[PDB]
Design an enzyme around this catalytic site. Structure first.
Site, short mmCIF file in Angstrom:
data_model
loop_
_atom_site.label_atom_id
_atom_site.label_comp_id
_atom_site.label_asym_id
_atom_site.label_seq_id
_atom_site.Cartn_x
_atom_site.Cartn_y
_atom_site.Cartn_z
N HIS A 1 0.84 -1.18 0.00
CA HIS A 1 0.00 0.00 0.00
C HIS A 1 0.89 1.26 0.00
CE1 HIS A 1 -3.15 2.87 1.19
NE2 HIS A 1 -3.99 1.96 0.74
N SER B 1 4.98 11.47 7.12
CA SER B 1 3.84 12.32 6.83
C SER B 1 4.00 12.94 5.46
CB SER B 1 3.69 13.39 7.88
OG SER B 1 4.18 14.61 7.40
N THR C 1 44.58 49.76 -10.56
CA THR C 1 43.59 50.16 -9.57
C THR C 1 42.71 51.23 -10.21
OG1 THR C 1 45.06 51.84 -8.60
CG2 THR C 1 45.06 49.60 -7.60
N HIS C 2 41.39 51.06 -10.08
CA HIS C 2 40.43 51.92 -10.78
C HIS C 2 40.57 51.79 -12.31
CE1 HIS C 2 39.82 54.46 -7.03
NE2 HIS C 2 41.12 54.24 -6.88
N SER D 1 33.44 33.29 -34.09
CA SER D 1 32.42 34.09 -34.76
C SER D 1 31.97 33.45 -36.07
CB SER D 1 32.96 35.50 -35.02
OG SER D 1 32.03 36.32 -35.72
N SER D 2 30.67 33.44 -36.31
CA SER D 2 30.12 32.95 -37.57
C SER D 2 30.49 33.88 -38.74
CB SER D 2 28.58 32.81 -37.47
OG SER D 2 27.94 34.08 -37.40
N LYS E 1 38.75 34.93 -35.44
CA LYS E 1 38.49 35.43 -34.08
C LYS E 1 38.22 34.25 -33.11
CE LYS E 1 35.86 39.37 -32.04
NZ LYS E 1 35.06 38.73 -30.94
N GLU F 1 32.74 33.30 -20.15
CA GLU F 1 31.35 33.68 -20.43
C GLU F 1 30.40 32.69 -19.79
OE1 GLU F 1 31.17 34.08 -24.69
OE2 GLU F 1 32.48 35.86 -24.64
#
Ligand SMILES: [Cl-]
Ligand SMILES: [Cl-]
Lengths: 460, 461, 454, 455
Positions: free
Chosen positions: B117, B127, B175-176, B307-308, B313, B320
């Site tokens: 069952h 439960s 830096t920056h 690239s297509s 490239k 990514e």
């Protein structure tokens, strides 16, 4: 207004201002939010500058008279005497270099009043850079906020919830799952659940401290320590620990990670965010428990704190749970801003520090203050509607199941239906259906329908 | 198609699920995506352990229990991942997927001649509310310990190995995004390695609560209708069979069903790891930028045509993938916290959604960390001479000339070196500064950019 | 040995499964990105197939591509559009952020299909003529999102609005107690509440329609960086015209600025904001409805929800709705994160943004129809219970403010609660029936349905 | 002597002697010391305007005595004008209806009126026909609408105009495109800035699109949206007075009075537009700081104006930090927005704090960015042309003549041998019937390859 001259230009600063030209230029450059550093960041900048002067004096790099003047001035700032001397916007150059210079300038003006000439850069910023100072101050403030203020406030809230859990140990009531009637619990069990959430919250904050307490000081401009003593970091941290008692402060495990990123603030905000999530659950259960007085749940009564409505006379509202859930929303928003800033550093420096600092320190402050208020003005004074709670439990279709072995689940379901229809307890309904006989004594019935025993609470 | 029973419900011929699952199929056609293999596995593990304990306690006949244990092991082994059709966006307790598991076990046993069952036998002592969250925390704990931490360790070790290889590869700091004093590539990579090591520490720090299981608390946390020690016994079996030492009974049984705060906590660690990975991946694709109009500090291994349309490239595709995974983890983290905050009274009913998001974040971070390590980090090469020449041409390195020629003349050296695109050294020479105030030896010691980076010195071995 | 064949690209040779219709670049991507285990959705593959056919059509029209080659591409692209080849798109969502790999997936599969009918197509030179991934993959994404918004979500929201509105009409005079801060307030009708819910969904439709002028913008024609290099100057206008004709979606349009259209995916961020606002609205509606259905004994017991599994029914559709809303909120944060982080001529978060925005459209679409049909439509109100709640709120003293003032009214409410009396009985027992308040006034003012001002 | 007794329906309260607030405000001071910050100037303005307008309409309808209405209107004008901001001490994190701040306004008006010898009851008179539940969100949406229309849109237009001006100035300044951070085909600096300008232009379109619902006001719905204890036309009459006084034609009565109080969906919608603008600004500011990077270690494409005192990109840093704050605030707003119950959303003061801050930050940083960064940018023209000509991807327009695969071999050899693409095409013997040297030199002109349109 007095006049000053940097290279190159003339700038007007307010006569009472202890800051100088570079701070005034920053005031003019960033009129964006109109909000500057908080008390805790200002304090930490003061603590850091005093410790740096101490170490520069100790190493013979800074004349003792100059060092003593910086230490005295820095102590005044750390003591919160000059909070009005830091006018620069939170939204400033991303290294926090403007607020660093603000501190150096203010310290030099304080020292001048005592007859000591300090060069803001050459003396007050000696062995430091425009890049390892502000994030060090940020992590000092955040560590102090965690250890000295938030964890004690959470413990106070934990203890208030736990005390209620004890008071209400045998206050039986119906469980709710999916918002639907369920088998019995006690009010004490539910509050022991809330208490565990806050206790786990304290554990979450404690678990972030090994990394929150890391300080970048000594790494100078890029993390290499160029133009500082090789042991500047460990010496400065030692002074800060000795002076503050904050043993969680430590030199960074890796000096580049400690300037290229602010991941420790992101980690800590996560713990605050989880505490906000817990507090949202606790506060929303409590205002639902207190809902009514006549068309709600009416399980408990919250202390009255103020009139509820400008138009509906006599109404009183759960205003502390409202303050808690709004604070929690703000911590969640602040947490998103912190993570956004954290992810976007480049190469040798993360340049989102003032924004991240504002958000993490505000989250610490809001949670600290609202936790104490919640504990003292709401939790402590809650009262339970004990008889109402027990009556609903004893009238619930959920408790007919232990009747099955006596009268069968068919008749148990009939008892459930008639009890609802007549608004009676299961017990009275069993009696009225004439089911007391050789099959079921009244004593067996009261045993089967003992709703407190169904809640399975540890006896004490 | 076959017919079952209230009724009547049509269920696919080769389906091992039964009527309640088929109802849930019809009730929730929302996302078209169901439980993942890890969640199915955990449900299998849990059902087998429950049957073992009910058998041990004399509550369930040994042959029934044996049949459940055998069927559950098949589920846990991934033999029936196609038997769980219910949408993620189901009843918020996960009760539909719980019944799905019960029905599939009963069907598997039936094929062996044993009658179970789904509720009375396979769900015995359990439960509709302490089981799905238990399976979720089992799955999340396994994901953390058995998969994510080893993948992070692998990435850490790859970053650390590059830090070691590049210990003396001096370059200019930034830096920056502006020119700064020298660092080494190895120093930068040791920083990246620390971030991942700290990430592992963060995951390890959440395990005491992530590993807490609700099992035994039954409908509302009281353990009504279960044995008083059901939780500890089931956990004992799970830990013995899986070796997952982090699994434990919950510290408070109401907290463990009223809230999913441990999932919110663990997502925070994953989110912090996503933040670290974003920094690391961004830096690496910027270092790799070019070949001629970017920074050209390093070369990433080629993995596919870029690239297509732009021939020849090649693009930083692994960074990514990492930064996109990190965005997904951040989004999943927001959904998890939202679900976590909105429980009511004895039950948080956002479990299937929270489970989907936390387990996907584990999975994405695990898989992309290994790919990042193996297909990108391991094969990076540095443009060593280019890096050093830029460092040796930097205005930022004239400061150690001050005590020899004064800061005014050092600034003039800096200015001229830029205008003529020459090194500082050559400029010092071309201005006739080499005399008895400054020998060539002294100049080279002062302008030693590797020494300026202050790298740790290794011992004689 | 016979399990594979050799294909090649400009990087070298690649072993490809013998029966696969994809070629070298797809296979590389299969090995580079095994991350989530999930690829493009049906709707994405359809938009890619549609777009490739439309490009070949325009290249044919302009005499740039030989009609025999163009017809083969158009034929193969239609097979792809219709779903015949979804199993030939194995590439993970978490691929290169331009969608280069899925663009080449489409080129290579089209080339292989056309080979079986005797036509030789170069995946780059022929199938990808006048195109880049950088304009075609965002174009395919915005086509799918625009289609999702116009053809699926808005009609689903209108179905929900109409179910909510019907209940507002049916329940127009079912008076009950309003609740504010969860506490007893003045009367409202169930109908009034549901008119509020209906407005939220109506406003939701207004939000989706307001984003369409920018969601429908397509990058097609901009090629590599937005300059249109290697495409006819009017390639964009022509391809969009074919698209509009074939889909019926007049909302598709050429981008206002070709650089913005590739450097950023701001229109997806914009549209997610509308979806997130709808999730916020749905959370309020579903939460109210499960609280109204709560109990019965321990809750408010205001209404009864239709039982779906299989009287005390769990609010399973409100739970599905609020979980869906959580997901939309999470997806929205992922989308904004990707959106912000473009660089120069290209935003390289497109496959991830696409996954999340298209899922958010789908979840809201499907759960709104289910909610409308299987919960809202069959709700039943406990009318006599509701009127009793309206009558028992102590706040029904409020309309007496102008007659006895705020402070005495407060005293009335508090005494009524203390002594467990009605407000009317308490007003009487406090001796307020006098010169400035009569029993007739009370019959007028304390009428709870009239107090709801329906 | 340093305090006085005031009372409310809950009892007596000690209030600072000089304070113009009374009992309920003082209770709130003690109940909510949480953030230590109260309502902003703009919020107090909107509350003052609204109380004045309400008194005007109650007077018009003969529900309120003229001398009482006159006293309220005069006091409200002082509050609106900013003379009493120090009399609003209540925390942002108060009851979520803003009841305390509504009573703050009622009590302070009563105290100001008493000084001129007019007795006003804070509830019965100053709050006549009103609830906190319609007035506090009304004051919030007034303040938000005003921020959008009178401050943010002009600030964005100013930034758009500065960016558009550079797009014109630099229309033919050719440079290398970058995609995936890698060398791509030519673009002009002007084309890129035309992209930035369009993002800001679309940002204005996004703000404009939310105004029909941002501008909706709950006023007149009173306690729950039914309008109980208010005149049937209270809302429309009050809105007319507000529109007349503020000049803000975007203000309107709510389409549905229940939705306008049970939810704050208009704030959530508006925040989404601001978040999208933050996303745009992040892209623009990032590109600009990368273009200014270096000079030796970076791209060195442009020069940013020096602001303090190798110039650090401090305004791009301010912009990206502001954007992070807007994103954070936006999440707080959506969270509060979702969690209303029945007749009232009780997250209003928190949602108001956050949306109004986001308006303010974006407004002020956009103007600073435009004036002190964008306007003074200077391009390094020769360096940029050299970058354009050096990209190996400039082989791309040869695709139709030599095919993708050969062009790929050309790019690869050019890189390897450190030669131009032109020389490499020649070296590989590709000059033939299918490509003349004149065609090659035509196709490789980088400015022409950028295809900048006629002005
Ligand atoms: Cl217990
Ligand atoms: Cl005062």
């Amino acid at each position: 207004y007095r006049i000053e001259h940097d290279t190159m230009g003339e700038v007007r600063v307010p006569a009472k201002a202890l800051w100088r030209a570079q701070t005034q230029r920053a005031v003019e450059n960033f009129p964006i939010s109109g909000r500057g550093l908080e008390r805790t960041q200002i304090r930490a900048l003061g603590l850091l500058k005093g410790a740096c002067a101490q170490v520069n004096s100790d190493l013979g790099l800074l004349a003792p008279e100059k060092a003593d003047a910086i230490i005295a001035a820095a102590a005044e700032i750390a003591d919160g005497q000059h909070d009005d001397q830091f006018p620069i916007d939170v939204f400033q150059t991303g290294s926090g270099t403007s607020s660093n210079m603000n501190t150096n300038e203010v310290i030099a003006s304080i020292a001048a009043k005592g007859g000591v000439t300090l060069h803001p850069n050459d003396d007050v910023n000696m062995s430091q850079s425009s890049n390892d100072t502000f994030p060090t101050a940020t992590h000092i403030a955040a560590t102090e906020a965690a250890v000295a203020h938030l964890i004690p406030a959470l413990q106070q809230l934990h203890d208030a919830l736990a005390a209620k859990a004890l008071d209400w140990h045998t206050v039986v009531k119906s469980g709710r799952t999916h918002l639907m009637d369920a088998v019995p619990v006690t009010l004490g069990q539910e509050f022991s659940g809330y208490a565990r959430q806050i206790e786990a919250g304290i554990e979450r904050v404690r678990a972030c401290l090994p990394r929150l307490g890391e300080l970048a000081i000594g790494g100078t401009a890029v993390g290499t320590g160029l133009n500082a003593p090789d042991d500047f970091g460990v010496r400065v941290v030692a002074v800060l620990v000795a002076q503050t008692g904050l043993s969680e402060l430590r030199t960074a495990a890796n000096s580049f990670e400690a300037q290229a990123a602010r991941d420790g603030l992101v980690e800590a905000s996560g713990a605050l965010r989880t505490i906000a999530v817990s507090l949202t659950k606790i506060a929303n259960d409590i205002r639902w428990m207190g809902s009514g007085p006549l068309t709600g749940l009416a399980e408990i009564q919250l202390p009255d704190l103020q009139p509820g409505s400008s138009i509906m006379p006599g109404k009183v509202n759960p205003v502390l749970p409202e303050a808690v859930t709004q604070v929690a929303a703000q911590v969640i928003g602040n947490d998103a801003a912190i993570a956004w800033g954290g992810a976007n550093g480049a190469f040798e420096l993360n340049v989102y520090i003032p924004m991240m600092a504002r958000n993490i320190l505000e989250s610490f402050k809001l949670l600290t203050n609202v936790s104490r208020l919640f504990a003292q003005r709401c939790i402590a004074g809650l009262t339970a509607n004990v008889e109402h709670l027990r009556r609903l439990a004893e009238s619930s279709p959920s408790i007919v199941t232990p009747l099955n072995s006596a009268i069968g689940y068919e008749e148990a379901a009939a008892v459930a239906k008639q009890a609802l229809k007549e608004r009676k307890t299961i017990r009275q309904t069993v009696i009225d259906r004439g089911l007391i006989g050789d099959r079921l004594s009244i004593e067996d019935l009261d045993r089967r329908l003992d709703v407190l025993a169904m809640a399975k609470a540890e006896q004490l």
